[PDB]
Amino acid sequence: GMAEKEAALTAAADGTVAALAAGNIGVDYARYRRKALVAYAKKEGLPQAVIDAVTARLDAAIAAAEAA
């Protein structure tokens, strides 16, 4: 169902944040992942609010990695 796809979106978003904080991806790949995960959410019909929270956590992670 939908919630299974929402759990997959959240897990992939969390893994992207975790990998970026660990330094195992660069910010350019994080932005690629963020864009691709938004496309996944839209094409799978996921609730906008979940896309918004996932995007907000990813944008904060990208901003921190930029700073450092």
Binding site: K5, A8, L9, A11, A12, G15, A19, A22, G23, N24, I25, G26, V27, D28, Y29, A30, Y32, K35, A36, L37, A39, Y40, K43
Partner: protein, 164 residues
Amino acid sequence: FACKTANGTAIPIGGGSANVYVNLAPAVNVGQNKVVDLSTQIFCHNDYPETITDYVTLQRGSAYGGVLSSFSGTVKYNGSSYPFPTTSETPRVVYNSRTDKPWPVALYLTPVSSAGGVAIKAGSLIAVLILRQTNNYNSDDFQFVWNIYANNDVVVPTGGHHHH
């Protein structure tokens, strides 16, 4: 898309160039010398296949570097041979699973001497590989570079002779 070396070291995906440290194990054959078989050195997977399928190709402009800069040869990519330096984009490999898969790449060098060889120090740059990711949800791509570094001291033969 995420990858690791044979000793568990995570290969950073993107950013600047990533430095990948691998063991070179040269082999002399008629008219073609193996430099390094990356399929024993680099293992890749899709960490979140439920969300997106990763398609990865080797891009044109991939070539030897360092003390091997002026040499050409062949790259074996997923069971087919291609000129190296690459002049076209290779076919794609699909990552749709958390299963680690060997990266099906090996580099060969065309003999250009009778018995010569180049000394490779550990920490020497050997090759500069250009990769490209695409996916099944948008038309975007992501290009990134792997600097291949030698992890061992070894002689790379440039001719038809084993070095003892």
